[PDB]
Design a protein around this ligand. Structure first.
Ligand code: HEM
Ligand code: HEM
Ligand SMILES: Nc1cccc(CCCCNCc2cccc(OCc3ccc4ccc(N)nc4c3)c2)n1
Ligand SMILES: Nc1cccc(CCCCNCc2cccc(OCc3ccc4ccc(N)nc4c3)c2)n1
Ligand SMILES: [Cl-]
Ligand SMILES: [Cl-]
Lengths: 362, 362
């Protein structure tokens, strides 16, 4: 049951990782330690510093991420020591608290034990650690339609949501050996939320909109040197358009543009009035104003594109090729007002990186 | 000097073209007529109906065009008979008048004689038949910066612009055999223009903005059945975003967003105010309102995307594969508010089509 492709990925990663850390001389000894270890166990264990740097490199190589400028300040939390459900839950609880940081969000990743045989040690079911539930029974739609399948899986396992439009989903994850996952309700004190108000339009609060403070992606596999960390939730702060132009605007999500147009006092009858466009701008202005007024970190898409330009420049000075996905880097609001729109990007996949993986639920 | 690749393209085009026109039985005789003609002359001549349909197929295959729904109603003008400069000029004059149609714009293409030896019979220098000049001498920028190189080439040949921000460039084209092109000033009576006003903000006219009515692309090569029509100017009507989000908004074009923000009474100091976004929407609302109030055909990007969805559906019912360039089909204003954003497109190049070609000037 060999065919160890892992040896080749380890040679590539350790060489580059130690190259960047100045530890270039330490490479031949460490690869020797690794090759024996691969022969004795079929795998190898990253150090402390390889793991932290590999997670940073993976953010740096994420073609679709516009916020990559701060890749080197990612806060890496090593929890490869976890063995029980309560330790997994507590680590996820801790990630939320330390990432939130009373609103001064810290880009943070918690790294759980990797896949051993390709067998998961911890299998997280949440798309994000904090997300709202979605319901969809006979005509009536409640909450976030994107969470319908996960919300159904949770309720099939004993959980029950109050069926508000913003029910917090529980943490749900399965351990190795168990046939079923466990779920834990989120403590309200850990979850910061932001009511959406408008700086000029006082009636905007009548929409009773809100979103959570911290997006913590928890369904992606971090791959470092051939080691597959399927459970490694990470977070940054939001870019405003993610909330105002997608989460609250998409017809398959909260679909609020019609109601936004009514409270800002414009008609929603004619395409040539550009009412969707106007409502999108006022809603996105409201999201930024609301997060800033509360003291929760956020960035607008113009500032974010300015930072990403410096990431482009910084990559060229370091002699690293830049990779990116143009179709994901452009913002969904005024993309041509950013430099990203007016250049091209090589969409090559460089490792370490973060990758999609099949949902465990149906 | 053979290596006739032309025979293969003719077999592919005539088969498909006659297939769609119901003339499937007439194919073997016509290809026989073509193969002899290729052997006798090194080329072949399209019919009347092959030419008109091939130009329509070429529009249908333009991956970057969102307005392809009306491909079958393209008005094809056959001027392969032209031989002199005055006949070329008159045909271009006529194209402008009949395409404009007092504001009820007709999608029209005028097809000049194709390349014979790869040698052009008529070589058009204009990017569009109607475009504004651009100037750029010691600090001072006037007009459309995108036209600077062409405006310089025209003035090097005796033309002189009044150096307003909206100088109409002359028609400029070279005939086969001449070392130099000729240029002809555009008659003002042929060119409809639209002053940009706002439906609600009366001060918007203080910006003194305007654009021309009809975009007539004149620098692309139409390829049909291996025959290269390098001179075949075509036109549709504008999509509003082309004017309000690019021509008047780009920093490398008319760069008006700052002045738009001032007349609509918002500050242009903070990114988080989304002032560029708001100004872009009000400017694009103004463009649509202005063209509609004048009676000049235009379409908004929402209506245009709705039409393109029906083009997608119509393509599937006809059993034709759909091709498209996602990065060009999405509008630059609220792209995620259109279905285009939320699906993918195969960017394969199918012929007949329109292709870029090297500018003749420096
Ligand atoms: C610091 C704040 C951050 C901002 C503002 C930011 C911004 C974004 C945005 C706007 C997207 C595209 C979202 C979409 O349109 O679906 C994105 C994608 C992504 N970001 Fe970041 N990001 C940040 C931090 C991070 C961090 C810390 C990581 C991981 C180490 C990361 C990895 C990614 C990945 C993997 C994707 C693509 C996910 C996918 O394919 O669905 N980002 N980022
Ligand atoms: C009927 C009105 C039409 C509308 C509203 C329309 C709309 C558009 C738009 C918005 C673009 C992209 C422009 C850009 O972002 O640079 C485009 C590209 C294009 N359209 Fe159309 N179009 C129309 C008619 C036509 C016609 C009649 C033809 C030719 C038969 C045509 C062929 C093309 C081509 C070739 C491109 C790509 C040009 C390039 O690569 O630079 N379109 N169209
Ligand atoms: N602050 C932060 C911080 C860290 C990370 C992020 C972004 C993570 C979001 C995960 N994302 C999941 C997903 C997968 C598949 C489709 C999705 O839908 C949204 C979307 C976005 C861009 C598109 C571009 C082109 C196209 N055709 N579709 C798109 C769909 C989301 N944010
Ligand atoms: N009503 C109508 C009717 C008929 C045809 C048209 C469109 C013709 C416009 C010709 N176009 C020339 C051109 C060439 C190269 C760059 C240009 O710049 C604009 C642009 C547009 C989309 C982009 C998408 C991605 C990206 N990276 N850059 C883009 C640049 C224009 N309109
Ligand atoms: Cl999100
Ligand atoms: Cl244009």
């Amino acid at each position: 049951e060999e065919k160890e492709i892992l040896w080749n990925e380890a040679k590539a990663f350790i060489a580059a990782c130690y190259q960047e850390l100045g530890k270039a001389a330490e490479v031949k000894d460490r690869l020797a330690d690794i090759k024996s270890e691969i022969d004795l166990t079929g795998s190898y264990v990253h150090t402390k510093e390889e793991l932290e740097h590999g997670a940073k490199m993976a953010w740096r190589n994420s073609n679709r991420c516009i916020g990559r400028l701060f890749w080197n300040s990612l806060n890496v939390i090593d929890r490869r020591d976890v063995r029980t459900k309560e330790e997994v839950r507590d680590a996820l609880f801790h990630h939320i608290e330390t990432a939130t940081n009373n609103g001064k969000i810290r880009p943070t990743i918690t790294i759980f034990p990797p896949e051993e045989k390709g067998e998961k040690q911890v299998e997280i079911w949440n798309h994000q650690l904090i997300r709202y539930a979605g319901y969809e029974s006979d005509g009536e739609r409640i909450g976030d339609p994107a969470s319908c399948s996960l919300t159904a899986a949770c309720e099939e396992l004993g959980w029950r949501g109050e069926r508000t439009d913003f029910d917090l989903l529980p943490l749900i994850f399965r351990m190795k050996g168990d046939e079923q996952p466990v779920w834990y309700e989120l403590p309200r004190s850990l979850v910061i939320e932001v009511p959406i108000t408008h700086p000029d339009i006082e009636a905007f609060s009548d929409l009773e909109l809100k979103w959570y403070g911290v997006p913590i992606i928890s369904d992606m596999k971090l791959e470092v040197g051939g080691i597959h960390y399927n459970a490694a939730p990470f977070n940054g702060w939001y870019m405003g358009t993610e909330i105002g132009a997608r989460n609250l605007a998409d017809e398959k999500r909260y679909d609020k543009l019609k109601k936004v147009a009514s409270v800002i006092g414009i008609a929603a009858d004619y395409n040539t009035d550009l009412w969707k466009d106007q409502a999108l701008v006022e809603l996105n202005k409201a999201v930024l104003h609301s997060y800033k007024k509360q003291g929760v970190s956020i960035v607008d898409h113009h500032t974010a594109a300015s930072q990403f330009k410096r990431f482009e420049e910084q990559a060229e000075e370091a002699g690293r090729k830049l990779t990116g996905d143009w179709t994901w880097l452009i913002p969904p609001i005024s993309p041509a007002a950013t430099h990203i729109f007016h250049r091209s990007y090589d969409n090559s996949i460089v490792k370490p990186n973060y990758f999609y993986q099949d949902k465990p639920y149906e």
